[model samples]
Target: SELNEKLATAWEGFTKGDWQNEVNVRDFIQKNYTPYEGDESFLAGATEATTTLWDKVMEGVKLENRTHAPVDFDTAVASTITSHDAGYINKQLEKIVGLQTEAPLKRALIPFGGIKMIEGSCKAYNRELDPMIKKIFTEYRKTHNQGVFDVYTPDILRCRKSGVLTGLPDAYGRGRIIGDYRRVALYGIDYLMKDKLAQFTSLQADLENGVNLEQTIRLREEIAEQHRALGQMKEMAAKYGYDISGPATNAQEAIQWTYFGYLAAVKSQNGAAMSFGRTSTFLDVYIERDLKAGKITEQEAQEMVDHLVMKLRMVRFLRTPEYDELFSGDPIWATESIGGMGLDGRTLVTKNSFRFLNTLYTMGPSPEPNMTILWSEKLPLNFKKFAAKVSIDTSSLQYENDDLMRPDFNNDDYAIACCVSPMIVGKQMQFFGARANLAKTMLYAINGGVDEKLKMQVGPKSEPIKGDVLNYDEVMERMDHFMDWLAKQYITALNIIHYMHDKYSYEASLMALHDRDVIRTMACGIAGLSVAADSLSAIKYAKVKPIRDEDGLAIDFEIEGEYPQFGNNDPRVDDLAVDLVERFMKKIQKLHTYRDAIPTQSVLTITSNVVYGKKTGNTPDGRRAGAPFGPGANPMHGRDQKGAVASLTSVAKLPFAYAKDGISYTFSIVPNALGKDDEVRKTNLAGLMDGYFHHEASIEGGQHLNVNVMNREMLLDAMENPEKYPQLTIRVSGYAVRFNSLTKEQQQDVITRTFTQSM
Candidate 1:
C-alpha cells in the first residue's frame, strides 16, 4: 500500500511541472524508484562516455557550416564516380588501412572509434588527385572489358533506354548486401582469423594436387583476400587496446567484437544499407552464461547492450548533397531482427530480447538499427506485450511473420539483410540488385514497346493497340514479349555488377567471417507491383479505353464497370498480384547467371516508390503520372476498402517461397483505433498480430509487416509545426526516419495511408 501511494505521488508531481527542469523529475525518481544494488557509477560512466563520443562525431560533420544550397543531382552523381575512379587497388587499400589502423578516438566508451573515421573517397573532388585518378581509370578501362563493367554496362544501358527498367548503378545503387554478422556473435574475431588461415592452407594444398584448376585458383584467391582483411581487423584490435581474436570471456567483449566486425564492413565499401542481422538471441547466450558465472550484474549487462545500440546509432557515411536529399537523415538501415523461432521448433525468446527492447526506454528513442520483431503465436506473451508498449511510446519498431519464414530456412538460421530479405547467415548470400519499374512496363506494352516518358522506342516496336478500345488478348500477348526482354536485361545487369563488385570492392572484412564457400542468389526486385496488378484487373473486369497523346503514346486510361482492387481481400485483384510474381519468376528462371546464382524476386519499393512513380507515366489503374505509388507490397492509398485485417488477408495470399527476397506490408493505425486503454491496447495489438500471422502461417502467405500506431491528427500537426515534435519517428517505408526530416512529398504519402479502426 505504501509503495503504491509513493509511486502515485511521484507521478502527480512529475505531471504538474516541467520535467525538462531535471531537478523536479530527478528528486521524484530518487524517492520513488529503486535502482539495482551495485556499482551504479559504472553504468553512469557508460552514459557519459556515449555522450562524449557522439559529440565528437557530430563536430566532424560540421552541420552548422553547411552551405544549404540546392544540390545538382547530375553533378553530384558525376563527382561520386570521379572519386572512386581516381584510386587504384593499392591506393584504395592504403586509404582503408589508414582508417582502420589509426589510433582510437580519445575517451571513447568502448575504447574504439566506430563512427569518427572519415571515408577515403570523400575527397574525390580534389583536382590534386587527378593524376592518380587517371591511372586508376586507365587500369579500370583495360580490365573492365573482361570484367563486370563491360559485361553488364551494355544490358544496363539498353534497359535504361527502355524506360520500362532502371538498373544502372547510379540510379539504383547495388545495396542490400548483408555480411554474416552472426559469425562474430557465434565465434570471436580471433577465431575467425584462425579458421580463415586454416582454410588458406587447405586451398593451397588442393592447388598443388591439381584438383579442379579453375576452382582451386578461385578458392585460393578468395582465401588470400580474406587473409588481408583479417590482418587489418587484428591490427585494429591491438591499436584499440582490446584482445578480440579469441573466444569472448564476457558479454561486454562479445558486444565489442561484434561491433568491430560491423564497423569494418561499412568502412570497407560504403554500401547504402548495411544490416546488423539478428543479434539479441545469439548474444543472449554469452550474456546468460556470464550472468550464471557471476561475471556481470544485470544492470551492467543492460548497460553493455545500450552502449552497443549507441554505436549502431552513430554509424555514419559521407554522402553528396543530392544523396542526402533523396535519402534524408542519412539512414544506414542496420536492421536487427528479434524474437523468432529456433531450429529445434522452439521459440528463440531470451533475456537479451527484453534487454534489446528495453534500450528504447533506457537509451531514449532512436531511428537506426531499424528495430524489428519476428512474430509467431508461440512467442512469450510478456515479450510481445513489452514490444507493443515500447512501440506505442516511441513508434520505433516493426513486426514480421515468422511462421511463414522458419520452414523455408535451414535450422532457423536466417537473418534479415536490409529491410525484409532473409537468408541463411553463412550458408546463403545475395547480390543486391535494384528493382525494375513494372508500372512503366505496362505503359510500354500499350504504346507498342515505346517509352512514353522518354519518347523513345527502347523495346521491340510492335503494333499499337487498334482504335481506342483495349483488348485483353492483345495486351497480354504484347506484355509477354516486353517481359521477356525486361527479364533478360535485369539478370544481365545484376550479374555484371556483382561480378565486378566481388573483383574490385569485395566485402572482405565481413565475408572473412562467412563460410569459405557460400550459395549465391541474384536478389532481383519489382517496383509498382500494385500498379501492374490493378491495371491487369481493370483490363480483365472493366471496359477500358486508352487516351493517347499526339505521339500515339497511351498517356491515360478511361474505364467503365466495377473492378475489384488489391488490398480489399478480393480475389479478382489479388489473383493478378500473385500472377505478377509467378510470371516474372518464370521469365527470370529461364536465364543463366554469373556464379550460377539462383534468381529470386521481391515485391518491395522502399522509399524509392516516389522516384519510381515520378519516372513512370499514367497507368490503366487510374494512377496519375508522377504521383507516388504505394510503399512496398502495400496497395495504393485510399484503395483498400476493408479494415487492416482484410488487407493482411489479401497480402497473405502471396506465397513467400516465390518472392523469397521479401514482400513488405506497411500500415498505420490510430492509437485509439487499437483499443480504449493501454492495457487493452497491448492485448488487442498482440492478439491482432498473432491472429494475422497464424493465418499467414497456415496458408504460407506474406512475409513482413511494419505497423505505425499513431493518430493522423498528430502527424498532421507535426507536419505543420515540426518544431513541436522534432524527435517523432515513423516507418516511411522499409526503415524508420525522423518525421520532420522527410521531404514534403514523403510526408503526404505517409499521411494518406488508410487507418483501420479495428482488426
Candidate 2:
C-alpha cells in the first residue's frame, strides 16, 4: 500500500508539474519506493529491457536524418535466421512481432515501431519457389474457365500473353489485400488473443451443422494460425517480463496492443500496402478514459502518440530493386483514417484526432502510415483547420469524401485500404484488381483489332476503317466486342491468381487476426480512362481519323476540330467518362468468380501510368504513342482548362457507387491558390473541400483526393538539386514520397501537371 501510494503520487506530480525539468519526482520515487521481496530484481530487468530499445530508437532517429532510407533489415535477418528457422512468412512474423512484444513499456508509454523487419526474404523465396507456383498458376490459367473463360476471344488472349492487359493479382500477385480493417472489434491485446480461441470453438459448432467442409478447414487454419500468432505476442511480452493477459487498462496498453495487431500483419507475406486503420478514434477512447481518471496528462498523452508514430515510421519491407523502383519511396502505407461525419450526423473529430495531426509537428515529416482525412461539411471547424495546417506544413495528408462515401458503406466504421479502396474494416477484404489499359484498348478500336505498339493482331481481325475520318458508330461497335472479351479475361485472370495466392501465399498470420467470416470483393480497376473518354469525345465532335501505318494499324490521329475534354466540368466529355465506368462495370458484373467474389472497379493507377504508357500506343485524344496517361481519376495535364474546381466537379460526375473499389482524384494547387494568410487559407481550403463533396441531385461527389499544396518552382528546385530537399514530400499518386526520390520522368510529370494558382 505504501509503494502504491508513492508510485501514484510520483506519476501525478510528473504529469502535472514540469516533469522535463523537475528532479523532485524522481527523488521522491527513489526515496519512498521499495519492491516486495524478489520483485525488485524483476522491476530492474523490465526497466533495463525497455530502456535498451528506446535508446536504440533515439539512435535510429539520428540515422533517419542522415538518410531517410529505412533501417537496414538485412542485419536483423542474419540473427532472425538462427532465431527462427522457418518460411518467409513465419520468419518475418516471428522476427518483427518478436521486437514488438519483447520491448518493455519503458515509461509505460504508447508504442508503434522500434525494430527492423524486412520483406526481402520473400523475394529470396521467389527465386526458389516462384517457378513451382508459376507452373501451378499456368495450369489454372489454362484450364479454369467454367463460366468466364468461354468468353475470351483471340484479342483478349493476345493482350494477356503480351502483358497489355495486366490485372494486379494476376500480374504481380501483390496488392493491398490485408489491412487493420476491423481492429475495433478486437481492440485490446488480451481480448484479441482470447477471441482467437473463442472463434475456434464456434467454428467447431458450424462444422457439426454441416457447414462447407473446405470453408470449415480454412476457418480452422485461420483460428489455429491466429492462436499461434497470439501466443507469439505473449511470448514477446514474457521476454520483456510484462503480462498482457488482461484487458488494456490505459492509453499505454491500448496503443501497444493496436501496434501488436498491425505488426502481425506487416511481418507476414501480405506484400501489398498495409493500413493502420482509423487508429486515432480507436485510441482516443482509451486516452479519454485515462485522462478523466487523471492517470495521464495532455503532454504525456501527446508524448505517447509521438512514440507510437516513431514506430509506425519504421514499418519496412525488403523487396528487390524493381519493387522499390515501382513503389519509389519505402512506403508501408499504414493508412490511418481520421475525421468524418457519423451516420447520426454527429462529427467524429475527437481531441486525439488533433493529437495525431500534432505528430507532423512533434516528429517533423516522414511519409508512412499515410495520414488521410475524411472530409465532410459536418466536421468541426477547428479540426478542419488543423488538418489543413498539417497538410500545408508537411504535404503528407490526403483526403476522402465521407459525405458521398458514408451512405454507400452505411457505416461510419469504414477504413480505406491502399489509396482509395474503402471497405468495412473486418467485414470486407478485396482481391486487388489492377487497371485494364483502356488506352491500349482504344487503339484496338482505331486499328480495327491490331496493337499499334506491338505491330500484331492483338484484337479480333475486324475490318479496318475504310474512311479517312473516324466514325463513332464504327469505333463503338468494335469496342463493344473487344470489351466483351476483355471483361471476361480480366475477371477470369483475377479469379485464378487469387485462388493460387490463397493456396500458396496465404496470409495465415494476418487472416488468423481477421474475423472468420469476412465479405470479399474482386477489386478491379481501369487505367487510361481519360484517354478513352476524351478519345470518344474527339471522335464525336472533332471529326478525328487515324493515320495508319502500312500494316493498317493507327500510328497517330488527325483532328479537324477542338473537342471539350474530361476534367473541364464539360458534360460533353464528363458524361462520356461516367458512361465508360458504368458500361465497363456492367460487363464485369456478368462474370462468376472464385469465392463468389463481388466485382468492383477503381479508377486508380498510382505511378503505374508511367509503365502503362510505355506499353500503350497513340490514341484519338491526340495523345502520342508511349505517352503517359493522366494519374488516377484526374484529367490529362493542360486539359482541365477551367481550373481546379471545374476539374473536381467533372470528377464528381463519375458515380461513386459504380466505382465501389475506388474513384480517386489527386488535386494539386499552389499555396497561393487558397489565400495569403493562415486563417483565410485554412478556411478557403476547408470550404473548397466541403464544396467539392457536398451532395446535389443524383451526384454526391468524388470519392478520394490526394492534394499537393506546393509551388511548381519548389518541385523543380527539388528535382534539380535533390540534396537540398531530402525531406520534401509530394503526393505522387495514391501515396506520397520524398520529392527527390521520384524517377526523373516522374518528377518531370509532377512538375508538368496542372497546378492552379487560384481555385
Candidate 3:
C-alpha cells in the first residue's frame, strides 16, 4: 500500500497515458516533459560536499593509471544484480551511490563473455583468475566466444587472423545494447514485471497455438529470465536501503532508481560499450517538479548529477592490452546522449542538460560517461555556447547531427550507442559486429584472393591484375565482385556471432527494460576508408604501378604524379569515399541478417585504424605498408591541405542514407589558433558546429564530430612527461581518452591528425 502511495506521489505531476499500461518511456517523455529554452545562468556549480567526493574518486583513477592496470578484481564470481555488497566513495558525502565492486574502483569478472579474455587480462595485470570460475567457464560451460569460434568457418578465421575483419566483438562482450533504464525509474520494478508477464503470456499462447513452438519456447524462457533479473534489480536496490518496487517519489529517488536500473545492467552484463540512455533529459521532468515544489535546490541537483557521473566514470571492464589499444584507453563507453529538438517543435535543452555537461568541470576531465551533444542548428544559441565552452575546456565531448538522425529515429527520444550508432532508446538494441577492412578488400582483388599478410588465399579466386599498372575500370569491377563476396562472408560470421552471443550471453536484465518487439540491428563497421579511397584515386588519376615481390605479391606501389585526396573538399576523391560505403552497404542489404535485424553500417574505425594498418599490405596509393589508417571516417593525415571547414565539408558529402549507423569525424583544434581568447573560442567553436551541420544535397552536415581543443605540442610534451598532466584529455574517433593513457605509438598517431588552425 505504501509502495502504491509512493507511485502516486511520483506520478502526481505527470500526465497519464498508455505509458501507465506498458513500458513506454517515450510516451511518458512526450506527455509530461518540459522544454527549457532559457540560458544556463540559473545552473549551479559543485558544492563542497560534491567537490570532496570527486577528488577522492580521481585519486583512485590516478592510481589505476599509475599502475597501468586495475587495482583489484573480483575473479572468483560472475557479476549479477546483487553480485557485490553495496559500496561507495564516501557514504556521508555521496548523493548518488553505487560501485562495480564492494571495494571502490575495483573491476568485476564476467565469464559469460569469455574466459580466455579474462585469463588474458589477468595475466596482463599480473593477477590470476580463480581456478574454479575458470574451470566452470572453460571446460563445463561454453562462453559467447567459444560458441562463436565453434561455428566460425576457415574463411572467417583467416580473415580475422589477417586483420581483414579487425576488432571483432567475438571474444569480448557484444556491447551496444542500451536498456531503457528510465522504465524502472518511471514505473518501478514490480510494474515492469507485471508488464513483462503479459508479454510472456502472449508468447505462451503462441506456443500453445503451435506457431514456431521451439522458437516460442526460447522466447518464453528469455522473458522469464528478464523478469527474474527485474526481481534481482529490486533486491539489489533494497541492499542500498531503497525500495524501487514503486516509482521514485521525488527527484533523488528518481535519479537513484534510474541509476539502479543501469547499475544493475553493468553488474550483470559486461557489455563493451554500455550507455546510460538519454537519462538526464528524462530525469529532468522529476527535477523540474521538485524545484517547483521547493523540494530540491539547484545546488543539490548539480551535486546529484556530479555523483552519478562519478559513478559512470567508475564503470570498468577488465581488458587485455590488445583490446585496450583497440579502443585506446580502457573504457566501457558510458556514453550519455544529451540535447535535441523534440518532434513537438520544442527544444529539449533543459537546465539538466547544462548540469550534465557541467560535471566535466566539477569532476575534472575524464573519459567515462561520454558526453555526446545532439547538435541541432535550431537549438538555443546559449546552450550551444555552453556545450562548445565545455568542449573547449575539457576536450571530453562529442557532437552528432541530431536533425540528420531524428527522421530515421522517428522520435526525439533516441540515443547514440557505442560511438556512432543512432537507435531509439529502450526500443532499439544492436548486435555489435566489428569492422571489415575495406583497404584489404582492394588488395585481395588485386592479388586475386591472397591475404598478403599471411600469403594465403582467403577471398574468392578471382582473376588477378596482370599488368604493372592498375586500370581503374578493371580495379572497380574486381573490387565490386570481391565486396559482394566479402559481404556474404562478413554477415555469416556476424550472424553466428550474435546467435552465440544471444544463446550464451543474453543480456537478460538489459532486455527486461526493452519492448517485446524492439528494433534489432546488425550494427557493422568499416576501417581504412581513406586508404581505400586514396588508393582508388591514385590509380584513376595518376600513374600508379604495383611492384611485386618474389612471392608474386604487390609489396609496393609507385605514384608517379599527383592525385586527389579525400579531405580537401575535392569531389574527385570524396565521391570515391561515398561510393565505397554505398557499395558495401548495398551488398549487406541483400544478405540474410540473423534475427531479421536491420542491416546498418558505419565508417567508424575507432582506434583499430592502427591495428588494421599493421596487417594490411601496401596500397596503390603511396601510403607505406605499416602506416596507421586514418581514424573513423577521417581522411589520411596531412592529406587535407585546405582549412578544417573544407575537411569537414568533404566528410559531409558521405551519404547518410548509405551509412545510417553513423559516420565519425573527429576535429582537433589548438585553443589559441581557434580564437584570440576563451570567449572568442567558445563562440567560434559553436558557430563552427552550426556551419558544419547543414541540410544540403548528398550531405547530413557530418554525422558525428569528436571535438578536441588542445595544442599538439602540449600532447607531444605529455608523452614524455606523463606525470605532469594527469588529466590531459583528447578526443579520438567517437570517444575521448586521457593522453597519458594511450600507448606511445597511439599518442604519435593522434598528433599526426590534422589540427585545425586559422580556420
Cα displacement (Å) at residue 101, model 2: 13
Top of the candidates by lDDT? 3
**Cα error of candidate 2 at position 41, Å:** 43
Q: Provide the overall lDDT of each model, using Cα atoms, as 2-decimal numbers.
A: 0.66, 0.65, 0.86
What candidate 1 gets wrong by more than 4 Å, as runs, is 1-149, 152-155, 167-175, 182-187, 204-212, 321-329, 695-698
Q: Taking the tens digit of each residue's C-alpha lDDT, what string does model 3 give over 1-759?
A: 423666676699778777766677888888877887777688788899888887786787778777778878877878777878998777888888788778787888989988999999888888878999999998998899899889999988888888887678887888899998888889889899988998999887788899988878888889999999999998898888888998888888888888999998899787879988798888899898999999999989998888888888888878888888788777778888898988877888788999998888877788878888998989988898888888888899999988888866668988989888888987888888878899999999999999887888889876678888888999988999999888998899999999998899999999999887778888779898999999999999998988888877888888889999999999999999999989999889998888889898999888889889888878888878888999989989878878878898899888878887889888887788678998898888988888888765555667899998878888878877988988877788888787777777887799998887757
Candidate 3 regions off by >4 Å? 1-4, 696-699
- TM-score of each model, paired residue for residue: 0.83, 0.81, 0.98
- Cα lDDT of model 2 by residue, 189-279, tens digit: 4455656777788878768887798889776876786677666655444443445544344677667656655655554443557777776
Task: After the best TM-score superposition of candidate 3, give how far the Cα of residue 337 lies from its true spot, in angstroms.
Answer: 1.2
User: What is the clash tally of candidate 1?
Assistant: 2
Using TM-score, rank the candidates from best to worst.
3, 1, 2
Clashing pairs in 1: 86-133, 190-245
RMSD of each: 11.8, 10.4, 1.7
- The clash number for model 3 is 0
Stretches of candidate 2 off by over 4 Å are 1-163, 170-175, 178-190, 205-211, 236-242
